[PDB]
């Protein structure tokens, strides 16, 4: 069903160096969060 116009795909990197991608997670955005701003601010997830 595609996205929901309020969903961001956040990468999950192994560590802070972000040199190894583990997988991807989809998160809904609250308020008026701009998916574009999340992409530009380098929002991510680290395993450690």
């Amino acid at each position: 069903t595609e996205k929901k116009a309020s969903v961001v795909t956040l990468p999950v990197y192994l560590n802070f160096t972000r040199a190894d991608l583990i997988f991807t997670v989809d998160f809904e955005i609250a308020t008026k969060e701009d998916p574009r701003s999340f992409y530009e601010r380098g929002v991510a997830v680290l395993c450690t």
Binding site: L14, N15, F16, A19
Partner: protein, 50 residues
Amino acid sequence: LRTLINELVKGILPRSWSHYTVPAGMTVIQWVSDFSERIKQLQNISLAAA
């Protein structure tokens, strides 16, 4: 043993010890703690499986 002692004295993580991927510039004193935590988790997993 000479090479391993040299690496330990300079505080560099031994190359033989490094078998799982780690962030660059990671010293041995924190590598020991990380490996200890990983071994603890592995023991919990193995105990649950057995």
